[PDB]
Paper text:
Spd-2/CEP192 proteins, defined by a conserved “Spd-2 domain” (SP2D) comprising two closely spaced AspM-Spd-2-Hydin (ASH) domains, play a critical role in centrosome assembly. The conserved centriole/centrosome protein Spd-2/CEP192 (fly/human nomenclature) plays an important part in mitotic centrosome assembly in humans, flies, and worms and also in the diverged centrosomes of Dictyostelium, which lack canonical centrioles. In flies and worms, the phosphorylation of Spd-2/SPD-2 at centrioles recruits Polo/Polo-like kinase 1 (PLK1), which then phosphorylates the large coiled-coil protein Cnn/SPD-5 to stimulate the assembly of a Cnn scaffold, and the internal molecular interactions that allow Cnn and SPD-5 to assemble into scaffolds are beginning to be elucidated. ASH domains are present in several proteins associated with centrosomes, cilia, flagella, and the Golgi complex, but the functions of these domains remain largely unknown.
Numbering used by the authors:
A (entry chain B): 969 to 991, 1001 to 1014, 1023 to 1029, 1036 to 1054, 1072 to 1267
B (entry chain A): 965 to 1015, 1021 to 1058, 1069 to 1267
C (entry chain G): 967 to 990, 1002 to 1012, 1038 to 1056, 1071 to 1269
D (entry chain F): 968 to 991, 1036 to 1050, 1071 to 1267
Write the structure that this text describes.
Amino acid sequence: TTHAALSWNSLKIGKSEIKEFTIIQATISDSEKNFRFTTIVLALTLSVVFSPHHIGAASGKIIQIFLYGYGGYSKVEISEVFKDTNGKMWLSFGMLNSENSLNAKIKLQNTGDLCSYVKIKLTPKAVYPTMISSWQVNPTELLLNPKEVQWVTLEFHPRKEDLALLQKSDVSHVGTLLITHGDEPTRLRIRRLYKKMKETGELNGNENETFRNIVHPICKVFSGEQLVSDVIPIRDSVQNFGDLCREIRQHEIMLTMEV
Amino acid sequence: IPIKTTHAALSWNSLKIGKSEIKEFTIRNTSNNKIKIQATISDSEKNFRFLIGTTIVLALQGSESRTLSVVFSPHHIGAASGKIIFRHYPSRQIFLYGYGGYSKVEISEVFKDTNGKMWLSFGMLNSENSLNAKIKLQNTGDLCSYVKIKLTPKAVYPTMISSWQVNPTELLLNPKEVQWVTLEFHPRKEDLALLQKSDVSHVGTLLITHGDEPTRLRIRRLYKKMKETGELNGNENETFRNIVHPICKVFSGEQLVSDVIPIRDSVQNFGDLCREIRQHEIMLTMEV
Amino acid sequence: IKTTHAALSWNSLKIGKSEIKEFTQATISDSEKNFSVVFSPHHIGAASGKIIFRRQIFLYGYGGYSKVEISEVFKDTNGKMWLSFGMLNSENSLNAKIKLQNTGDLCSYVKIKLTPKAVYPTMISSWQVNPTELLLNPKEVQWVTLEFHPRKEDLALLQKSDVSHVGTLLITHGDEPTRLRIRRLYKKMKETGELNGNENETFRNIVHPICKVFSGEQLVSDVIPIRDSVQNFGDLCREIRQHEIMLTMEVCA
Amino acid sequence: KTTHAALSWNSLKIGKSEIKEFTITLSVVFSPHHIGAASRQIFLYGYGGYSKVEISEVFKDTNGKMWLSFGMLNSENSLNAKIKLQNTGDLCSYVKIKLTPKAVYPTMISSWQVNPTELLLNPKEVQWVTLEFHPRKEDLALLQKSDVSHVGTLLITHGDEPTRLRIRRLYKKMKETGELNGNENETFRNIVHPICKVFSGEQLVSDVIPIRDSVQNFGDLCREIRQHEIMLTMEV
């Protein structure tokens, strides 16, 4: 057995993903009957399917080898922004009135069944020491329960120094808003696993230049995090950690401004 | 006066007050003798000048020839007609035409990207319903403005346009006039069959040709004169006709202004006159 | 008894792949066991059938595909194709080429149309493209050459930016048999003049230059026993693949 | 009180002049007569010349984006490509480059091999930057859906080498006194820190030492930091 255990990502009800493991009687000792092939025999690459019947955790046993899954999903839909046929997302503040500053809002809708996590990070195009002081965006980070609606409001007080670069064109790219979102439990799983790997020192050299910067703002305890104990019996490992980071959803709304 | 100009006349486009356009023409002596001629611009409204004042003089030595440049600055909105006279220092005459004012049709309630495109979204297809949107057209100029709108669907079935309803298809806008263009789309099952794959689907493209109305009258007279002679019929005009043909039609509401009849345009100035036809292509999408 | 569809035709389907079409005690009569009704080509070629109510409704189909790949042109992650002429050398004109290869099993048809970004009456076209129209036998590869002679009217608008859009190359391609089918029915479309009012400007412009007799067109007689009609034409004209290539040119310095 | 005990310009092109206002209001003009530094009650600093860092052998868009394609993933092989970098300027150039892949997995940087990661170019020096991608199994799991896949983004921060020495001089003080020692700088440092390290081949020029720049004008000096992004494309 190459993989000591198999862990699936959070999957919506009525969808099944397969995963393989390389290796006598065989049987899935599952009480909730989430994992199937149900009981086989083979003489000497095996593949197991996962179909979440109930929203919630799923733990299975093969005659031993451990199987891990968790059912439900999260779909953060961004609204009141413009989306292109190509795919890119666009938010316009309007024209620059003298002696005034600009401000806008975004709507976030959770169309899933599980809790969702959202970390927002704003990056302006111009650079100067107080480049963070000109933008004020709130909430910077939050959680959304299923079918919850939240408005994120962002105010921009343009200084002369950024507009000195925004001068040239009539519609000026001023910044990019990155929204990292997804399901809350996968964040708990990756947080637990990252604490495990950092405590043992697996990733603390060079390969950690970019990776920490991608996983840092999500492994912290969020504000409003009501600790759910459904994810404590699921132990994920190093080999499947990439498949866990694959469910980190990221979108980059564009910020524009006319003349 | 042995002389042979290149341009029989010089005609300018439409220029804002306080803006000047230059145009040059090559004047050539034909006789192998020594001629010396005076060029005087008889301008009544101070619209045309030289490149100095209102009168110059030059000598030409046996086909030794030159290139003169004339500037145009329309002080008043309205037509401008002058004539340069070449006398000896018997007459030679070249006449000049220009017309002042401008038009700036501004499209509004549409989205503009940093790239340059303009984007209009209908929304999300609700079951048993159809979609609709609107755009604002504002004339911020000094002259009357002309707008021809033409819609091209993305799907290709024989009755593709009958699912689209666009109003107004063609119109004029006076300065500081506001007009709203309404677009209704009741999709047939054949339209959505391709839009399936993505979440935001391109459904059509709306072309808006706009500009100043009088230049349309000038281009219309020139296009009608040229089309009957067969000058503009063949291969090199496939794209040009398709942009300039639907605009030479008689518009609805066209109040015939007689200010452009004293302006004589020619074959030689047809390209730079048609280059000032402003054209934009709004995108039409939805989010299924 | 009465059927909203007196006949049922499909499009040209890939080998071994099935296409379903719905229509609204039960026996069928097909010769090559090809066939709500489902279609699967068991012989690479045309397909026919006459079902028997228990009283006849005619079914038609055609099997095969034509995958014409455009190469030596840059493709985008978003999906837009991009061709560059390079840089405007003084006293010279710019040139480029694209390759088109039919990686399918049926004949492919390719009509090319160019639209410049500059509009002006010169009567000597700065663009020279060859071949404007052609057809490809299976696995036939052809090169399309494009030459641009920049006159001052072209460069007068291309001045502002460093990378200038100079033209748009539309390639309408697909399988020859569906072109014969659409042309055959399109001739009858004109016998009644059914949609000449406003459709005449967006539909005819897309489907008329395809109904002309191509050069090299060797008349295949496999599409004559086919009886597709007006109602399925909307579906039949769906297999006209149309791609757009950008034409770009970098300005000096 | 004249709001600035010192006033610095940027590196200006040959023979073109830029005016700057300095309140007291007053306006002053600079024009470079010699490629090199420049120094009543007067206290002013400036320096003339330019470095045009041109990226070539990469496809550009009418919109302005840049695109590099590795070709198609042949089985059992790994992919590699190269870009040309030419200094069509008059002063030395600095070209700190960093690549960030589009796939998130713990060994991101190791699968990518890019050289040179750091270098500087004197005027009209031409260098080729090679970048090789060994597709690890985590990478292709995301690139499956479409036919043309975005695999990474390569940031090239380039500009004038001499202005970099001034930026380092000001940033070292600004951090030794802790003016900008906080964490909000996490978006600024990522933009300006990888250029303040000592490059290889850096021959210390002493022409930038008499240029006494201060805290307030740092923004204007760091305004001339050119930033381009190259898209990384893989077919199939």
